[PDB]
Amino acid sequence: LNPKIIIFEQENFQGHSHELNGPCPNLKETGVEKAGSVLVQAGPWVGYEQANCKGEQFVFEKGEYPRWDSWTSSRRTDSLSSLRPIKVDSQEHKIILYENPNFTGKKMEIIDDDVPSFHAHGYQEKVSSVRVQSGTWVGYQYPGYRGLQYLLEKGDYKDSSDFGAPHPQVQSVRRIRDMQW
């Protein structure tokens, strides 16, 4: 998977166009020295007034920018001379619970939020394995955080016995967000 942004000569995506899948410090080399419109298909990108990523900055996100003034708010210039993909730092706490052991069968990915009822998300299956990619979680046998507790931390639990469960049943999970030291 690559980033992808298309710059056009004229407004409303007309004239010559050039697709960039990486950084370009001089957009004159694309044949589109000063773009009239920009289409972002996979980003986000940051464009600059001047070459080599200098001057005023414009953040481009997935969508249509049909004119020069659509992406910039203070016009000293209408120049767009360099572009690069933004390496976005967007952390999320992810835990994936599986029907069968060794991360097989039906699964349910939980991101960040607490889940007091697995059935409320259509997951009525047993939970035989868990992959904690990030975060500190507590799994429970029954809905509303009831029954036996299973502290699930970063790593692989290929069987339900690995997180101390007598049988493969988990119906609610909550994330531990706070720490006083």
Instruction: Name the experiment that determined this structure.
Output: X-ray
Are residues 79 and 15 part of one domain? yes
CA distances from 132 to 30, 42, 67, 146 (A): 44, 28, 45, 21
Same domain, 126 and 161: yes
Give yes or no: residues 34 and 94 share one domain: no
What's the total number of domains in the chain?
Answer: 2
Which of 40, 71, 88 finishes a domain? 88
Alpha-carbon span 103 to 123, nearest angstrom: 15
**Distance (Å, rounded) from C-alpha 3 to C-alpha 44?**
8
* Rounded Cα–Cα distance for residues 157 and 143 (Å): 21
Q: Quick one: 66 and 115 in the same domain?
A: no
> Looking at 43, 66, 88, which one is the last position of a domain?
88
In whole angstroms, what is the distance from residue 152 CA to residue 127 CA?
Answer: 13
Residues 110 and 168 in one domain: yes
Q: Quick one: resolution in A?
A: 1.7
Q: Are residues 80 and 68 both part of a single domain?
A: yes
Find the Cα–Cα–Cα–Cα dihedral 65, 67, 69, 70, rounded to 10°.
Answer: -20
CATH number, domain of 84, equals: 2.60.20.10
Task: Give the Cα separation of 45 and 60 in Å (integer).
Answer: 5
Question: Both 70 and 121 in a single domain?
Answer: no
Q: Based on the domain organization, do 84 and 126 belong to the same domain?
A: no
* Domain extent for 11: 3-88
* Domain limit, last residue, from 88, 110, 128: 88
- Strand ranges, E, within the chain: 4-8, 17-20, 37-42, 45-50, 54-60, 63-65, 82-85, 94-100, 104-111, 129-132, 137-142, 146-152, 155-157, 172-175
**Shared domain check, 112 and 96:** yes
